[PDB]
Amino acid sequence: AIPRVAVVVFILNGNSILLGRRRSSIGNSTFALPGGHLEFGESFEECAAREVMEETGLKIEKMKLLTVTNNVFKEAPTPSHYVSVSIRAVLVDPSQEPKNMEPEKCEGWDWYDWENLPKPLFWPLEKLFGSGFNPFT
Amino acid sequence: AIPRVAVVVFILNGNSILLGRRRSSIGNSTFALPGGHLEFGESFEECAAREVMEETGLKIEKMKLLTVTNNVFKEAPTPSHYVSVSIRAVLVDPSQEPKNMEPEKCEGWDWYDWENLPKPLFWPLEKLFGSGFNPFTH
Amino acid sequence: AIPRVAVVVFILNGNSILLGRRRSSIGNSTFALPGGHLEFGESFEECAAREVMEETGLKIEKMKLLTVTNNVFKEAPTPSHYVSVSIRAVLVDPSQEPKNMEPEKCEGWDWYDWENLPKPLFWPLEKLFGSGFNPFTHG
Amino acid sequence: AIPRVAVVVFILNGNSILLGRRRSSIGNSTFALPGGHLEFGESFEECAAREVMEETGLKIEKMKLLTVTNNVFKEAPTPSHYVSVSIRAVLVDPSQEPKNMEPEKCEGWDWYDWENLPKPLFWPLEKLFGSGFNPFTH
Ligand SMILES: CC(C)=CCC/C(C)=C/COP(=O)(O)OP(=O)(O)O
Ligand SMILES: CC(C)=CCC/C(C)=C/COP(=O)(O)OP(=O)(O)O
Ligand SMILES: CC(C)=CCC/C(C)=C/COP(=O)(O)OP(=O)(O)O
Ligand SMILES: CC(C)=CCC/C(C)=C/COP(=O)(O)OP(=O)(O)O
């Protein structure tokens, strides 16, 4: 077991971000970001665009590195350790709506207002927000 | 082959940072930061202090996250991909001097002024500095 | 697989361009330009006029190079990578209407006004326009 | 045979571009740009950076698409057809010296002033300049 690299994407649309409830043995039914695992030779931005396309069908642009978090899941059915790179992006077409391309992993994607976020948030995301992190600013 | 996580440490001492020439198959003879590979369950700060201890003997404190870089070495003898978390830290004892504690991996560690950095810098470090990154004020 | 060269044609007619919905494993039912694959020894302009003739029956002239785009489809049924040369052209006979000469690749061709383009556009086209590219005024 | 994509790079340094005489069955001994063949999945910029590193060791940045040319070599020993994407770039470190990293394919790289270009230029490059193309102002 070694740390693995993930990229998660804050897709900003107006005052909203895209979230969807996980179907997973880690954080089941909590609201999480679209994201994926970084592949050998891939840039953060190439991974962000690929994962978002794979999971939601959405086309994004104007990507920007935000931060990196250390996310250890000790009590998981298989304990895992992710180092997660956060990327901000916006839609190429602001009217494009997400599709649930991987329903085995997610209940569906929807837009949530920064001032009315749902609960429960996936703990890595809740923890990051609790630190004062704001993807818009 | 998959991306692996490293932590690299800017040890800030006055106006200087610690650098040492690599003895390595990647970036041989270039000036680089002390650093290490993140272990399972380890925090960024724990890895930074441990790697600096292992390589230099220096005791550091007040670790703070600076940024993250993507460093691919496809044409290396062994293709490697590192995601590198940069950490800022200071000496617990500002009079402590570095030792070359892993002398097979580094020619020796010394302090370099921010305004008189040595050449050649390890390419990931040169690339990061070329973006305007400054570890003292970031 | 290796990158392959395509030529795509912006046929400018008044304020309109020619588009048609693809019948394809890639970008199915999205609006795209007439175009074709560059043949060995062929010029961009020859490719543009030939592909437009083959797909639409239209006769074009005054071909001019616009730009080049890199379009990778790693997740297609068959992963593909195209390098697409954009060409501007006009009708030799402005009254000539397109025909759906290759109905296996396209639902049909129509003229669409630059300020009222249809949706959904084929993703390479949407991406190019998103950059501010305008075939009428480019260059 | 099928058209194949190349990328060629105008590395701008002051008023100069990098050129080197080809050792090749096509355009032998003529002055040409660093470049390479586009790989499946690669962006134009990734190819430009990779090819320049492979051939010269130089690190480049600020890459921009310039134009595209159609370069048919019917008279070649193996007739070839290249579609060549021109990319503008600059050095990360303007003091970095080129190396002749593939000395079987190039006699050596040097910087040439825009107002004193060498002869004979590789015909695809000569022909492009003959149209009035200028990589500094495009
Ligand atoms: C700050 C944030 C939001 C960090 C995200 C943490 C993360 C990548 C968890 C693993 O998710 P996963 O679904 O990729 O792992 P698995 O498929 O193994 O459950
Ligand atoms: C200044 C920056 C961004 C450095 C990050 C790049 C990096 C971790 C290279 C590998 O070093 P390594 O010595 O830990 O790996 P290896 O011994 O396998 O070559
Ligand atoms: C028509 C337009 C706007 C094209 C832009 C870019 C592009 C990838 C063309 C290739 O499509 P193709 O149909 O020629 O290739 P394939 O048949 O393999 O899908
Ligand atoms: C200045 C311009 C427009 C150059 C483009 C022309 C070109 C790609 C020639 C082939 O180079 P190559 O060295 O890759 O050919 P080969 O390897 O087949 O000998």
From Swiss-Prot, chains B, D:
Cofactor(s) recorded in Swiss-Prot or TrEMBL: Mg(2+); Mn(2+)
Protein name: Nudix hydrolase 1
Note: Has the ability to complement a mutation of mutT in E.coli and thereby completely suppress the increased frequency of spontaneous mutations.
Source lineage: Eukaryota, Viridiplantae, Streptophyta, Embryophyta, Tracheophyta
Binding note for cofactor: Magnesium may be the real cofactor in vivo.
A single cellular component GO annotation: cytosol
Originating gene: NUDT1
One of the record's GO molecular function terms: dihydroneopterin triphosphate pyrophosphohydrolase activity
Localization in the cell: Cytoplasm
Binding site for Mg(2+): E51, E55
CDD domains assigned: NUDIX_MTH2_Nudt15
PROSITE patterns assigned to the protein according to its UniProt record, in alphabetical order: NUDIX, NUDIX_BOX
Regulation: induction: Not induced by paraquat, salinity, high light and drought.
Catalytic activity: 7,8-dihydroneopterin 3'-triphosphate + H2O = 7,8-dihydroneopterin 3'-phosphate + diphosphate + H(+); NAD(+) + H2O = beta-nicotinamide D-ribonucleotide + AMP + 2 H(+); NADH + H2O = reduced beta-nicotinamide D-ribonucleotide + AMP + 2 H(+); 8-oxo-dGTP + H2O = 8-oxo-dGMP + diphosphate + H(+)
Species per Swiss-Prot/TrEMBL record: Arabidopsis thaliana
One BP annotation, GO: DNA damage response
Pfam families in UniProt: NUDIX (PF00293)
Free-text function comment from the UniProt entry: Mediates the hydrolysis of some nucleoside diphosphate derivatives. Its substrate specificity is unclear. In vitro, it can use NTP, dNTP, 8-oxo-GTP, 8-oxo-dGTP, dGTP, dATP, dTTP or dihydroneopterin triphosphate (DHNTP) as substrate. Has some NADH pyrophosphatase activity in vitro; however, such activity may not be relevant in vivo due to the high concentration of manganese used during the experiments. Plays an important role in protection against oxidative DNA and RNA damage by removing oxidatively damaged form of guanine.
Disruption phenotype: Increased level of 8-oxo-G in genomic DNA.
Assembly notes: Homodimer.
Mitochondrion recorded as keyword: no
Protein family: Belongs to the Nudix hydrolase family.
